[PDB]
Every structure is written in structure tokens, then in C-alpha cells.
Ligand binder design. Structure first.
Ligand SMILES: Cc1cc2nc3c(=O)[nH]c(=O)nc-3n(C[C@H](O)[C@H](O)[C@H](O)COP(=O)(O)OP(=O)(O)OC[C@H]3O[C@@H](n4cnc5c(N)ncnc54)[C@H](O)[C@@H]3O)c2cc1C
Length: 447
């Protein structure tokens, strides 16, 4: 059986791993159009901030190691087209220019997404950078120590834009973050959390310019100004972190696509065509908090979909269990984590929720190490089933969100969590820990 896997990033990589333990026998070709196998773009912040010194070690696999395991790795080789009826792909070797047709028994594609660019006047003056992959990681690092870079502007106030803002502020630059949305990180966190985080970033001289539409980049040769509908900002460097486009225009006409460009797949990762499976950022995933399919571009999703595509290679036998959208990050001193439905998700989905927020020290009063923690529990008004939760503290309490993700998937209620058995020991928590305490508040509010 011959399986061709497209992409060496999180989705393609786990499809090769599960192929190796479920079909050791198979002939596996692994294709990557780029030059570097399995660079971890998730580790770009650690590298930019100097925590990791070698950019080439920010990876989780090499072609050499996969070849020791019997996989045929083809880097600098692009899949140009798929011919799904005859079960063939056309591939182009990018160093020699040679094209060739390859036949397959099963095809798994994880083509990913590309950084979205603002296509506005000034579009590319030099020093308007993107943040994805090795090459952009290297170029961004060189700018961190450039004495000519004093002002950096990042467009986008989501996860990636805040990682770039923190890394340039820690390198000693003045950073302005611009976005049309009214709060940074609103897709992950509600206003009581992003209000604290906005103060924290402003303390580290990051200006957050919310509610503005970038109109043009100005400059001579290279960027010098970013002008919005409301203002103009000096910029020696712009990082555009506004979002991501699915890398699928080459597939139009071959596979069914949704209007926004994402590949249509069912719960077995099957596309519209027999024997080709699609996984990763270019797909929708079952989202258990709201029982619907949502595009949640996270590495954890691509990895699980990649293994489920191999489980369903022969027969649709193993429907995907669905995910809660869990994410986590440190922003200067704060470590936050969230899962499930928050305010912006409930809006998008037209879902009504109730929520309690507790802010208090997470250790008992006599303990000198005590610190404030914020915890918000979101639940269904009718059933009181748990729908989401967000937590933040300068202490790392983030592993508690792993219990809430399971609570959502098992459809537990506020009462289940108010009395759930969580350990107590006074150097670690209070007799009713952070989850218990917020669920006890919710039970009282519904009494
Ligand atoms: C800066 C940054 C920080 C992030 N941090 C986190 C984090 O901390 N936690 C988390 O869960 N997620 C994080 N993510 C999201 C995560 O990186 C993505 O969800 C995940 O990489 C998607 O995997 P993928 O396989 O779908 O696609 P991609 O990573 O986009 O990879 C697609 C791969 O396929 C290759 N390819 C595409 N087309 C072809 C072709 N036709 N022929 C051959 N090869 C091709 C591409 O070159 C690329 O190597 C982050 C993303 C970024 C950019």
C-alpha cells in the first residue's frame, strides 16, 4: 500500500507517525516544498527572546531520522496538483525543475495556511515582515538587534501579534500594536482578563491602538509610517499578524472547498474525493462546546486529525471525538489559559451563556507566597453544563484548564465541579481549589 503525505508540519508529521505504527509495511512518501523539515513556528518566540540560541534546533523531526525509519522524505519537492480519479499527483522538484507524476493508494494532505497580507498602498516597501516559518524567524531575529530599528508596529492583536509585540519590547524597542478589534486577545479571553493584560503591556511600553483600520504604509524604499483612518505611526519595522489564509487555491476544482477556502472533510477526515484525506489549518474541526464545526488553527488539532486520518485509511471506523479549542500563553508576568466558549465565541455562534468570575489569592491567607488568580467559568443557562473557562495569574495554574476541557467533553455541570475531588495541600492551593471555588459561586447564583 503506498501512502503519500503532503507537508512536514504538525498535521503531515503525525500522519506519518501513525502510519508507522499502524501500517509498518506501507511505502510512505513524505513531501515538503520547503527546505527545512518540521520547523516549529510555535517556538519562534523562545528563539526571538534569546531563550533558545540555535534556530535550527527549534524543530521536532529531521528527514534523516524519518529515512532511518524507512520513509522517503522529499524536501524541496512541491505537489503541484492532485488527479483524484486516477490516483496520481504531479510533483515538482524545486532544485532541478523536474516534474513527475506519482501514483498513490491513499493521499493525506496537510497543506496549512499562509500569513494574510494587507493589500494596501505601500504593500511592500522593505521591512514589512510576516511571522511564520524559519526564514521569517531568522529575519525577525536580526531586526531585534538592529540599532536602526527603534519603532516597530505590529498589526493584529491576537496570539501571534502579542508574541511579536512582547519579543520586540523585550529587545528594547518601542512597539505599537494596531487592530480593528477593540481588545487584544479577545478570541481567547474576555474583558476582565484583557484589561489586566493591557495594563501589563503598557507598563512595558507597548501602545495598544484598538479600533483603527490601517490604510497605507508610507516610506521611501522602506517603511517609515503606517497610517490608519485615525492616526499615523512611525514604524521602522512592521510585523503583519492579522491572520492566516488556507493554502488551498491550487485545489479549487479538485476537491470541494467551503466559500472561505477551507477543505470540506467529514468526521473521518475524508475529502469529497475517494482516498484523499485532509487535516490541519486548512480544515474545520468538530468543536464540542457548541456541537458544530469551527476552524481552530492550533497545532494540537492538526496532530490529532493527522492520526485520525490514518485510523480511517481503509474504513471510516473511528469518528473524531472533537476538541474544545484549548490554548495557553505567558504575556510578560501573566500566564493564562482558556478553553471552550468565551464572549467572542458565543457572539459568533449565537449561543447564550452565564458566567461567574472569581479573583482572589489562590493560597490561604497565612501563606506568604500567595498571589491573585482570575478564574471565569462559563456555563449553559438551562442545563448548567460547563461550556468554557479562562484563568490567569502570575503563578502558573494553567494545567487546571486541562480539567475543564475534559469537564466540557463529558458534559459535566457546575454542581459536578463544585464538589469534584481535587487535592488540597496548603503550599499548592486552598481547601476548595480554583475550579471548586468558581463552581461553588455558580451554584449559589443558580440557587
Ligand atoms: C508564530 C506561531 C505560533 C503558534 N503557536 C502555537 C502554539 O503555541 N500552540 C498551538 O497549538 N499552535 C500554535 N500555532 C498554530 C500551529 O502552528 C498550526 O495550527 C499548525 O502548524 C498547522 O499545521 P498544518 O500541518 O495544518 O500546517 P502548516 O504548519 O501551515 O504547515 C503546512 C506545511 O505543508 C507544506 N506545503 C504546503 N503546500 C505544499 C505542497 N503543495 N507541496 C508540498 N508541501 C507543501 C508547507 O511548506 C508547510 O511546511 C502557532 C502558529 C504560529 C505561526
Amino acid at each position: 500500500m503506498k501512502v503519500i503525505v503532503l507537508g512536514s508540519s504538525h498535521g503531515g508529521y503525525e500522519a506519518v507517525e501513525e502510519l508507522l505504527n499502524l501500517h509498518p509495511d506501507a511505502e510512505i512518501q513524505w513531501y515538503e516544498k520547503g527546505d527545512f523539515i518540521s520547523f516549529l513556528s510555535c517556538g519562534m518566540q523562545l528563539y526571538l527572546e534569546g531563550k533558545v540560541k540555535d534556530v535550527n534546533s527549534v524543530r521536532y523531526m529531521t528527514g534523516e531520522k524519518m529515512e532511518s525509519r524507512g520513509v522517503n522524505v522529499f524536501s524541496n519537492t512541491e505537489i503541484t496538483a492532485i488527479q483524484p480519479k486516477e490516483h496520481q499527483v504531479t510533483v515538482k522538484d524545486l532544485v532541478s525543475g523536474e516534474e513527475r507524476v506519482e501514483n498513490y493508494d491513499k493521499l493525506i494532505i496537510s497543506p496549512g495556511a499562509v500569513p494574510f497580507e494587507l493589500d494596501i498602498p505601500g504593500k511592500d516597501l522593505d521591512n514589512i515582515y510576516l511571522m511564520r516559518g524559519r526564514q521569517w524567524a531568522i529575519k525577525l531575529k536580526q531586526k531585534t538587534v538592529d540599532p536602526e530599528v527603534n519603532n516597530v508596529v505590529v498589526i493584529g492583536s491576537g496570539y501571534i501579534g502579542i508574541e511579536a509585540a512582547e519579543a520586540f519590547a523585550k529587545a528594547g524597542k518601542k512597539v505599537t500594536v494596531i487592530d480593528i478589534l477593540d481588545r487584544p486577545l479577545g478570541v481567547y479571553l474576555d474583558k476582565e482578563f484583557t484589561d489586566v493584560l493591557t495594563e501589563e503591556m503598557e507598563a512595558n511600553n507597548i501602545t495598544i491602538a484598538t479600533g483603527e483600520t490601517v490604510e497605507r504604509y508610507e516610506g521611501d524604499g522602506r517603511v517609515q509610517k503606517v497610517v490608519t483612518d485615525k492616526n499615523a505611526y512611525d514604524a521602522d519595522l512592521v510585523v503583519v499578524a492579522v491572520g492566516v489564509r488556507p493554502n488551498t487555491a491550487w485545489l479549487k476544482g479538485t476537491l470541494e472547498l467551503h466559500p472561505n477556502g477551507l477543505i470540506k472533510t467529514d468526521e473521518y477526515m475524508r475529502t469529497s474525493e475517494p482516498d484523499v484525506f485532509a487535516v490541519g489549518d486548512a480544515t474545520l474541526i468538530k468543536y464540542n462546546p457548541a456541537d458544530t464545526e469551527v476552524n481552530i488553527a492550533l497545532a494540537t488539532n492538526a496532530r490529532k486529525q493527522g492520526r485520525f486520518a490514518v485510523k480511517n485509511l481503509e474504513e471510516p471506523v473511528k469518528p473524531f471525538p472533537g476538541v474544545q479549542g484549548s490554548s495557553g500563553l505567558a504575556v510578560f508576568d501573566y500566564k493564562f489559559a482558556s478553553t471552550g466558549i468565551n464572549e467572542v465565541m458565543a457572539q459568533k455562534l449565537g449561543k447564550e451563556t452565564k458566567a461567574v468570575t472569581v479573583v482572589e489569592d489562590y493560597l490561604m491567607d497565612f501563606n506568604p507566597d500567595k498571589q491573585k488568580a482570575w478564574f471565569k467559568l462559563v456555563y449553559d443557562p438551562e442545563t448548567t453544563q460547563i461550556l468554557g473557562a479562562q484563568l490567569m495569574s502570575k503563578a502558573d495554574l494553567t494545567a487546571n484548564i486541562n480539567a475543564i476541557s475534559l469537564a466540557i467533553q463529558a458534559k459535566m455541570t457546575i454542581e459536578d465541579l463544585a464538589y469534584a475531588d481535587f487535592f488540597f495541600q496548603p503550599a499548592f492551593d486552598k481547601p476548595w481549589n480554583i475550579i471548586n471555588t468558581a463552581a461553588l459561586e455558580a451554584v449559589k447564583q443558580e440557587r
